[PDB]
Amino acid sequence: HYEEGPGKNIPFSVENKWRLLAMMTLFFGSGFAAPFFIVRHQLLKK
Amino acid sequence: FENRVAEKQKLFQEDNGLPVHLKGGATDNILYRVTMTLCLGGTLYSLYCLGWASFPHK
Amino acid sequence: MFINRWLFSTNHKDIGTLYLLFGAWAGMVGTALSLLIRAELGQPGTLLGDDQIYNVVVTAHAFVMIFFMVMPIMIGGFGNWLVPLMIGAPDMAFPRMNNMSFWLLPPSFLLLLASSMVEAGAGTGWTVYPPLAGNLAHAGASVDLTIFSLHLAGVSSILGAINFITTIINMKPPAMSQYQTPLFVWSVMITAVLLLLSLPVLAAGITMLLTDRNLNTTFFDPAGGGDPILYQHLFWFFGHPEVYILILPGFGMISHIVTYYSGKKEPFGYMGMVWAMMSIGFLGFIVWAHHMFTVGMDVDTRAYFTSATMIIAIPTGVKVFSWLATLHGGNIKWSPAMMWALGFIFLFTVGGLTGIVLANSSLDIVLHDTYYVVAHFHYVLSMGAVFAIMGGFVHWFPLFSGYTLNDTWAKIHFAIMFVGVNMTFFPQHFLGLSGMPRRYSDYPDAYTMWNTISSMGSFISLTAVMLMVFIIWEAFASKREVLTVDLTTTNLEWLNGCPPPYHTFEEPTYVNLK
Amino acid sequence: ASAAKGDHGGTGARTWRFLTFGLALPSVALCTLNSWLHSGHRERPAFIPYHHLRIRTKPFSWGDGNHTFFHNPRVNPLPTGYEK
Amino acid sequence: KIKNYQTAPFDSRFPNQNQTRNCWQNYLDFHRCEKAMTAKGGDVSVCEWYRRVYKSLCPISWVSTWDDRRAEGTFPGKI
Amino acid sequence: KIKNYQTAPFDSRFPNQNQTRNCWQNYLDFHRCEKAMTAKGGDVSVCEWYRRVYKSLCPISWVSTWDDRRAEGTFPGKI
Amino acid sequence: ITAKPAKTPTSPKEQAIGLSVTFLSFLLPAGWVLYHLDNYKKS
Amino acid sequence: MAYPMQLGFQDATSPIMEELLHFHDHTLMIVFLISSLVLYIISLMLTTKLTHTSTMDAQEVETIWTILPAIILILIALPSLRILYMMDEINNPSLTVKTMGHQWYWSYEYTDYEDLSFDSYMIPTSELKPGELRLLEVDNRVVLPMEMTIRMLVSSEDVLHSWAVPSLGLKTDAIPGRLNQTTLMSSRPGLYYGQCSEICGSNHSFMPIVLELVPLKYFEKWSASML
Amino acid sequence: HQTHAYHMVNPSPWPLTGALSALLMTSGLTMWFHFNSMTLLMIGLTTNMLTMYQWWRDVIRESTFQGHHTPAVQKGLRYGMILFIISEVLFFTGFFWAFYHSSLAPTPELGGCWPPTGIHPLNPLEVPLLNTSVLLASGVSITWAHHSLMEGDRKHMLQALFITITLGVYFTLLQASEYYEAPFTISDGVYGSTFFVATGFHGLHVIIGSTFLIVCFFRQLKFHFTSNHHFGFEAAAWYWHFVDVVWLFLYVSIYWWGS
Numbered sequence A: 001h002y003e004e005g006p007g008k009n010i011p012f013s014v015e016n017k018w019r020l021l022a023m024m025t026l027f028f029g030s031g032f033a034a035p036f037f038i039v040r041h042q043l044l045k046k
Numbered sequence B: 001f002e003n004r005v006a007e008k009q010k011l012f013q014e015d016n017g018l019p020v021h022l023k024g025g026a027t028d029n030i031l032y033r034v035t036m037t038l039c040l041g042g043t044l045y046s047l048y049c050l051g052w053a054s055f056p057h058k
Numbered sequence C: 001m002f003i004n005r006w007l008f009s010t011n012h013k014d015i016g017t018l019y020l021l022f023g024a025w026a027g028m029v030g031t032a033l034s035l036l037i038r039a040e041l042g043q044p045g046t047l048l049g050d051d052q053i054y055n056v057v058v059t060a061h062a063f064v065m066i067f068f069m070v071m072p073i074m075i076g077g078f079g080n081w082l083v084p085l086m087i088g089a090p091d092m093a094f095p096r097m098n099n100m101s102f103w104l105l106p107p108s109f110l111l112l113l114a115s116s117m118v119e120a121g122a123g124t125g126w127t128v129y130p131p132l133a134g135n136l137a138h139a140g141a142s143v144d145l146t147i148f149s150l151h152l153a154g155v156s157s158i159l160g161a162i163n164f165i166t167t168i169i170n171m172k173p174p175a176m177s178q179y180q181t182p183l184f185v186w187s188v189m190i191t192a193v194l195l196l197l198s199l200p201v202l203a204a205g206i207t208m209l210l211t212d213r214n215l216n217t218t219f220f221d222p223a224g225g226g227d228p229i230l231y232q233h234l235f236w237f238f239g240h241p242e243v244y245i246l247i248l249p250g251f252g253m254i255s256h257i258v259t260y261y262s263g264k265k266e267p268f269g270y271m272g273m274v275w276a277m278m279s280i281g282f283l284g285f286i287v288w289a290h291h292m293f294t295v296g297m298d299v300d301t302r303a304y305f306t307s308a309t310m311i312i313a314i315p316t317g318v319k320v321f322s323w324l325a326t327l328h329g330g331n332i333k334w335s336p337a338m339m340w341a342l343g344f345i346f347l348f349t350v351g352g353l354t355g356i357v358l359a360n361s362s363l364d365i366v367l368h369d370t371y372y373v374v375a376h377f378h379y380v381l382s383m384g385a386v387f388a389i390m391g392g393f394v395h396w397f398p399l400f401s402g403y404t405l406n407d408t409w410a411k412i413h414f415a416i417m418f419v420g421v422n423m424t425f426f427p428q429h430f431l432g433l434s435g436m437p438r439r440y441s442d443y444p445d446a447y448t449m450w451n452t453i454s455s456m457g458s459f460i461s462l463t464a465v466m467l468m469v470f471i472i473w474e475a476f477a478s479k480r481e482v483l484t485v486d487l488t489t490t491n492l493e494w495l496n497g498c499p500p501p502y503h504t505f506e507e508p509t510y511v512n513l514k
Numbered sequence D: 001a002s003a004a005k006g007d008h009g010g011t012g013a014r015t016w017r018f019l020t021f022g023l024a025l026p027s028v029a030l031c032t033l034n035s036w037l038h039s040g041h042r043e044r045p046a047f048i049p050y051h052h053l054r055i056r057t058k059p060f061s062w063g064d065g066n067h068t069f070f071h072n073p074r075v076n077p078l079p080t081g082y083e084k
Numbered sequence E, F: 001k002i003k004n005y006q007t008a009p010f011d012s013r014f015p016n017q018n019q020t021r022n023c024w025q026n027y028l029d030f031h032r033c034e035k036a037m038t039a040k041g042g043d044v045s046v047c048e049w050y051r052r053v054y055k056s057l058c059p060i061s062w063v064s065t066w067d068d069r070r071a072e073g074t075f076p077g078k079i
Numbered sequence G: 001i002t003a004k005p006a007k008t009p010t011s012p013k014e015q016a017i018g019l020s021v022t023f024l025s026f027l028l029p030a031g032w033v034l035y036h037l038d039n040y041k042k043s
Numbered sequence H: 001m002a003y004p005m006q007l008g009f010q011d012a013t014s015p016i017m018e019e020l021l022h023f024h025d026h027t028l029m030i031v032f033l034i035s036s037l038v039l040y041i042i043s044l045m046l047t048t049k050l051t052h053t054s055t056m057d058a059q060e061v062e063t064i065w066t067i068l069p070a071i072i073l074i075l076i077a078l079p080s081l082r083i084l085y086m087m088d089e090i091n092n093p094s095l096t097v098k099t100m101g102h103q104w105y106w107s108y109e110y111t112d113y114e115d116l117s118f119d120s121y122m123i124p125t126s127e128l129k130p131g132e133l134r135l136l137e138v139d140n141r142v143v144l145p146m147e148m149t150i151r152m153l154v155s156s157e158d159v160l161h162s163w164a165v166p167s168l169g170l171k172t173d174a175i176p177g178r179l180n181q182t183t184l185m186s187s188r189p190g191l192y193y194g195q196c197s198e199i200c201g202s203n204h205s206f207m208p209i210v211l212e213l214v215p216l217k218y219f220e221k222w223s224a225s226m227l
Numbered sequence I: 001h002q003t004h005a006y007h008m009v010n011p012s013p014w015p016l017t018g019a020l021s022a023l024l025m026t027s028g029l030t031m032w033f034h035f036n037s038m039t040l041l042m043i044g045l046t047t048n049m050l051t052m053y054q055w056w057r058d059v060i061r062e063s064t065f066q067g068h069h070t071p072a073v074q075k076g077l078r079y080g081m082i083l084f085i086i087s088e089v090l091f092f093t094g095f096f097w098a099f100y101h102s103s104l105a106p107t108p109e110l111g112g113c114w115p116p117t118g119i120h121p122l123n124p125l126e127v128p129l130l131n132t133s134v135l136l137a138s139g140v141s142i143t144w145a146h147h148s149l150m151e152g153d154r155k156h157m158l159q160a161l162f163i164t165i166t167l168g169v170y171f172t173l174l175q176a177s178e179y180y181e182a183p184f185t186i187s188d189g190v191y192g193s194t195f196f197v198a199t200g201f202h203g204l205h206v207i208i209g210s211t212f213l214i215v216c217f218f219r220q221l222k223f224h225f226t227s228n229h230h231f232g233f234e235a236a237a238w239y240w241h242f243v244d245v246v247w248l249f250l251y252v253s254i255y256w257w258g259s
């Protein structure tokens, strides 16, 4: 069986709020950054 | 043919903790590893092809 | 155990959590694309490039927002989490197929990404009309990757539709009829029927575009006797149902939120709400050519599509007035979720009304392919679908996570977003009436003031998006664990606590027939 | 509306086998005879390079790019006409 | 010969926004008439109405393409 | 262009036992051609092939009835 | 809703950190790309 | 053309565009009224301490909220459909002009008598003469006679385009293999601007339409001048 | 620990491998169409077949061998299969729409007629009629098989199912031969496009449906079905009748009316 309860029913840890902040920053930040870098890729390509 | 369903019922209800996709025995594990290796390797390969196709080439 | 739980799931709650995470990430991507749009238009001239790079951005913005943010959040996320709980069922009918509907979406998104990285991208519009999307004007792999992205998203939603219809028809308590199920459950059932019937037609149409591009068919190519307008019919036969798919689960959530924070045990006029959703779903299949009033159709056909489109206002107005009548007499709790829902009722109504303006094919001649249309659908999407998403997220976040949000921060977030979306989209009505076309990277000088204001609004909404992320972090950082909520007698999804155990309703509810 | 039979005391396997061998497979036999009568190859028509036929907007992803997937040299001309 | 032609009049056979078949029909009608007035011993002046109508309505590139195909032997309409 | 006309030749449009439409169509064609010529000035002699064919094929009483109804204004075909 | 007091309370100073980090994670990469747009349109 | 800070429609240049202006006024009044009533009722529902939380019967009130919107819809549809059938009426024009969309410019054909044709390209910003309009001028305008019924035929030689002139109330898609008809009648001389209105690739934003409306005698002089 | 009748399924890898197989087949088609290579596509086809094989194998384990298909579970699968067939009907509707759109309003490029100038359709009274009798006959034989199973008759169930499968194979070989003999091709304008894409997707469903029938045949040989519980057989029969009805619509629309 699996762990249950608050903070246990999720694929990411909330044991440490600063590690969590890094995770969430990487997660949402990577999605927000991706279109800017794709645009730069198309501009640089040719 | 003879009806051997009862012996498969005994096999697949054995209390051994195995999930159904592995409960047939060692053949299941081989087929699973073949499938998953082809899927994950094929996916890595598709990523390499993106990288190649993403830049002017040929 | 981690891989078994999160990659091999057969659990409706964990699969719902995966969809919510996926949709949130997609929302960031779609928000970034929307800011690139508004940066290009934020002053006269050219920022990025010509219309190709610009309309790759526009096209991706729409696909991400619709297929990777709204539908996964509403249907995959809230639907999977809430539907089984609301009917006392122990999971979905096809718990393993359900996981495949989820895992088809990262590959779908990867194909969309690939489309934008190879060649010059698919700068077609999310409608992907030929011949612009054909193999002469869009040679190379980009459009084909886009078609394949839609194919996988389509299969994901079709299988998910089959799962939701089966679950909702077959897995209620034996005493519960369809007229005892909650309105959000109804809204997901009807959404699922629309998906089941509309996506295969889209799949037919984009498959014909694929074969025109790669197997020398000419479905849409006049040189072979084909017709570009046939593609448009096939696309919009799906695409009008699709916008009702985008809003119906939102209607269902709004019904629950307004009921809850009015302190009511039930929405006003339940059977009228069911009727209205079924009517909207049915009428949504017979109006598609209002996306085609300028293509050259006969006048009698334009008259029929004008009339049939306007009639949808009648059942929709029943829902709007029923929400108002649910507020009526309530002990109003001014929670952040209530604020989202009240903003929904008003702003959805404005957007619906400019939809009725566009239904008039004579006026649509001048409004079609202008920013008036953009204003219409961002009021029902950015201020309707999204407001229902935010209201349901703030309302049910303590159920899914077991932790409370900071209500003051959530109210601030609502306030910022409300200003931002209205500053972004209200001036676009003026741009449309005065003739600014859609899908333009630059505009005649007269259009500068309202484009400048609209782009400023888009940055305010960006600040709201960033703040939301912080608010979710703060909740998980502080770990205020839920104890009780009110109104559990009429909100069954809460009665197994927060979060509910992995398995719920192993012993089903007892419901008798008197 | 054109049929002509009876059958329904109560329907079952025996009746559906009766239909299979007494009606369905005889119909297949007769259509098989009909087809193996009108088989044999029609006079292939003069080639005319009509612009709405033999469409080529992109090379096929097999062979030389110019042959359809089930190309039949006897009856399928290329954009330039029948092969040798 | 009953002229003073200005542009093609309304044609109840083609009352709708799509005028493709109107251009097509008058192009066919002109060339069928012109062929009849040659192979049987007459004057193409009788064909002039269709000529003016199709020239008024038909894109120049459609006319040009159709003419090329008639000369190539690949025109798919019956003349 | 040149005669030696003996009788109406086989017409692939009308290959079966019922030749009613063959008679009808050539009657229409003749009178349509005639009308077109007489107006724009030209010669009904270009219409001659249709006249010979319908005369060969059509019962006298049908031609006579159709002619009467054209004069009366009650002919239901389009000329 | 009712809830237990926070297990790991987040002070106003901790919130300023979380907010700042969150905003920077959105702003700095996009800012870097947009700052260098001219540098991209020339390569 | 549009002007700075414009809120509504460009001034009507044709009778049908005036009809649309008056119909929009009528419909916008209804949109404003319904929007404001919903906003008002929201505030009314939210501003009392009085409560009523037991079950409410819905049947009586739902007659009113279906019948009244039905009547409003009819009051919109009646003038809307009148204008629709007005636009469609037989009008017999005195002139037919074709336009063909291209990536990225328009061509025009006047083949009623002479075989006149020409291409019409946006003036680049770097070539505008002083006081001319960025993204809107063309080198060769569509010269047309004012106060006359003109048949415009629209098609395309490559991808979709759409031929639009907002102040005449015109927008007709340009579709290869298809010949779309619309009717044009300007009440006034002058210059009337529009822009390509179906996404068509790289320079969709940069292939405008400019009509030049002049008296008939001046149109005839211009036509005669092209021999 | 449950006191409901529904099936809590073991955590499974086949959803992930199926979704990855979709990625490999679609990126593999892209690679085949644009970068002259079939490698990714072959991997995707292989993993898709492995995925389907193991997933439906597990469904058999869960039902015949473990007993998880209560009547409530069976009822869900009935709905699921009906809904799936509905989605497939709508998929075909899109291709019929394309066919009627092009054929009821033939453009000038065709000659303004249907069939287009230069197209010589198959004679619908030859092989297409034979194919029609073949699929109709197989609808009769699969009904005989169903009743034999319900009446407990192993031998005649197997005979009738074998006849059904033989007729499906016969249809497929007749259609392959007709494709090869057809004087028109998929590149022959909108006539060839509608003909080959619509009958081609139909032929795919015949092969799928025949394969499903073959699965049922071997499960019947292994005594998996009871006289009352055999939903895989019912599903395969429903799918087979769907394939037969689509054919009838193709035959009347494309082969006959459109000839």
Ligand SMILES: CCCCCCCCCCCCCCCCCC(=O)OCC(COC(=O)CCCCCCCCCCCCCCCCC)OC(=O)CCCCCCCCCCCCCCCCC
Residues within 6 Å of the ligand: C350, C354, C418, C419, C420, C422, C423, C424, C426, C429, C430, C433, H007, H008, H009, H028, H031, H032, H035, H036
């Ligand atoms: C939350 C704030 C965020 C900040 C962003 C802005 C938010 C929007 C708030 C803005 C508050 C809106 C109040 C009504 C706006 C009408 C402005 C107007 O003069 O419109 C004129 C017309 C065309 O008119 C004309 O052809 C002639 C105009 C000139 C008249 C002669 C006077 C000459 C000088 C003109 C002075 C201006 C007159 C205005 C007089 C002003 C009268 C009210 O344009 C249009 O049709 C545009 C219509 C768009 C369709 C939606 C209408 C229904 C919305 C009702 C609730 C609003 C929700 C807002 C969305 C939500 C709002 C809360």
Ligand code: HEA
Residues within 6 Å of the ligand: C127, C243, C244, C246, C247, C290, C291, C309, C310, C312, C313, C314, C316, C317, C318, C320, C348, C349, C350, C351, C352, C353, C354, C355, C356, C358, C359, C360, C364, C367, C368, C369, C373, C376, C377, C380, C381, C384, C385, H034, H038, H068, H069, H070, H072, H073
């Ligand atoms: C959530 C998504 C959503 C929703 C719900 C709607 C709802 C409606 N939409 Fe819209 N629409 C879009 C998303 C949506 N739309 C999108 C994305 C496009 C553009 C696609 C593209 O080109 O990319 C679009 C385009 C679009 C067009 C094409 C315009 C053009 O391209 O030229 C039209 C035309 O008729 C239209 C009309 C309507 C109507 C009549 C409704 C109605 O359902 C609204 C009914 C609601 C009300 C009327 C308000 C509440 C009612 C009352 C308070 C009662 C009283 C009211 C009256 C009596 C009028 N929409």
Ligand code: HEA
Residues within 6 Å of the ligand: C020, C023, C024, C027, C028, C030, C031, C034, C035, C037, C038, C058, C059, C061, C062, C063, C065, C066, C069, C070, C124, C125, C126, C127, C374, C378, C381, C382, C385, C386, C389, C390, C393, C421, C424, C437, C438, C439, C440, C441, C458, C461, C462, C465
């Ligand atoms: C759901 C659909 C949706 C949404 C939400 C949006 C949001 C926005 N859109 Fe979108 N847009 C489209 C769908 C959408 N759009 C479509 C279909 C088109 C037409 C495409 C075409 O023409 O082909 C379009 C076109 C379009 C244009 C016209 C481009 C052109 O014609 O040239 C513009 C320009 O300003 C624009 C801007 C914006 C802006 C500033 C937002 C902003 O309001 C966005 C602000 C941010 C949000 C609303 C947050 C989103 C994130 C979440 C909700 C996740 C939350 C997380 C959790 C709950 C955990 N859009």
Ligand SMILES: CCCCCC/C=C/CCCCCCCCCC(=O)O[C@H](COC(=O)CCCCCCCCCCCCCCC)COP(=O)(O)OC[C@@H](O)CO
Residues within 6 Å of the ligand: I052, I056, I057, I059, I060, I063, I064, I069, I077, I081, I207, I208, I209, I211, I212, I215, I224, I225, I226, I229, I230, I231, I232, I233, I235
């Ligand atoms: C050359 C070879 C080419 C092959 C290409 C790949 C295509 C092949 C797919 C063929 C489909 C085979 C499906 C086999 C299903 C076997 C499992 C099964 O049938 O499972 C049954 C349940 O049915 C169920 O899940 C019902 C499951 C329904 C599955 C329906 C499958 C249709 C798939 C269509 C997919 C493609 C769509 C086309 C593209 C547009 C098990 O229940 P019972 O039968 O009651 O038994 C229990 C009793 O024994 C108790 O007494």
Ligand SMILES: CCCCCC/C=C\CCCCCCCCCC(=O)O[C@H](COC(=O)CCCCCCCCCCCCCCC)COP(=O)(O)OC[C@@H](O)CO
Residues within 6 Å of the ligand: C093, C094, C095, C096, C097, C098, C148, C151, C152, C155, C158, C162, C200, C203, I007, I009, I018, I019, I021, I022, I025, I026, I048, I051, I052, I055, I058, I059, I062, I063, I068, I073, I077, I080, I081, I084, I087, I088, I091
């Ligand atoms: C351009 C190229 C595009 C390529 C895209 C490829 C996309 C995906 C790859 C697909 C891999 C499929 C692998 C096999 C899936 C079998 C699913 C299935 O058979 O699901 C069954 C339910 O669906 C039911 O019945 C209903 C009947 C079965 C449905 C099977 C559908 C398969 C998907 C085919 C695509 C359909 C699209 C339709 C519209 C055009 C069983 O559900 P489970 O939750 O498993 O178990 C429940 C337990 O109680 C069973 O004991």
Ligand SMILES: CCCCCCCCCCO[C@@H]1O[C@H](CO)[C@@H](O[C@H]2O[C@H](CO)[C@@H](O)[C@H](O)[C@H]2O)[C@H](O)[C@H]1O
Residues within 6 Å of the ligand: C035, C036, C039, G027, G028, G029, G030, G031, G032, G033, G034, G035
């Ligand atoms: C539409 C959404 C986008 C929202 C706008 C973002 C708001 C601004 C965020 C700040 O971004 C930073 O800005 C710096 C400038 O202030 C850049 O430094 C640049 O400029 C500096 C000063 O000229 C140099 O020191 C650096 O080396 C050089 O990278 C830096 O790269 C960039 O990350």
Ligand SMILES: CCCCCCCCCCO[C@@H]1O[C@H](CO)[C@@H](O[C@H]2O[C@H](CO)[C@@H](O)[C@H](O)[C@H]2O)[C@H](O)[C@H]1O
Residues within 6 Å of the ligand: B046, B047, B048, B049, B050, B052, B053, B058, C110, C111, C114, C141, I027, I030, I031, I032, I035, I036, I037
């Ligand atoms: C999300 C996935 C999206 C996928 C979209 C694109 C799919 C196919 C991408 C192309 O794959 C590459 O294509 C090259 C061309 O066919 C191959 O051969 C190449 O191998 C060498 C690479 O330089 C050289 O021999 C040649 O240039 C060339 O034949 C190369 O091995 C292969 O990986």
Ligand SMILES: C[C@H](CCC(=O)O)[C@H]1CC[C@H]2[C@@H]3[C@H](O)C[C@@H]4C[C@H](O)CC[C@]4(C)[C@H]3C[C@H](O)[C@]12C
Residues within 6 Å of the ligand: C230, C233, C289, C300, C301, C304, I101
């Ligand atoms: C739009 C669609 C044609 C799509 C096609 O071109 O492929 C056609 C086919 C049948 C048409 C409908 C039918 O002709 C019946 C109605 C006839 C009325 O004059 C207009 C509405 C009316 C309801 C039509 C609207 C529209 O033109 C329909 C729906």
Ligand SMILES: C[C@H](CCC(=O)O)[C@H]1CC[C@H]2[C@@H]3[C@H](O)C[C@@H]4C[C@H](O)CC[C@]4(C)[C@H]3C[C@H](O)[C@]12C
Residues within 6 Å of the ligand: C271, C272, C275, C318, H059, H062, H063, H064, H066
């Ligand atoms: C009959 C049905 C269900 C009643 C029930 O069993 O509870 C009810 C539910 C919603 C009702 C409809 C809605 O209230 C909307 C309309 C209201 C009008 O007053 C009558 C027609 C009208 C279309 C109603 C007809 C009928 O009374 C409906 C359809």
Ligand code: CUA
Residues within 6 Å of the ligand: H101, H102, H104, H160, H161, H162, H196, H197, H198, H199, H200, H201, H203, H204, H205, H207
């Ligand atoms: Cu031409 Cu847009």
Ligand SMILES: [O-][O-]
Residues within 6 Å of the ligand: C239, C240, C243
């Ligand atoms: O679609 O509105």
Ligand SMILES: [Cu+2]
Residues within 6 Å of the ligand: C239, C240, C243, C287, C288, C290, C291
């Ligand atoms: Cu619509």
Ligand SMILES: [Mg+2]
Residues within 6 Å of the ligand: C294, C368, C369, H162, H197, H198
């Ligand atoms: Mg358009």
Ligand code: NA
Residues within 6 Å of the ligand: C040, C041, C042, C043, C044, C045, C046, C047, C441, C442, C443
């Ligand atoms: Na710009």
Ligand code: NA
Residues within 6 Å of the ligand: I146, I150, I230, I234
């Ligand atoms: Na049965």
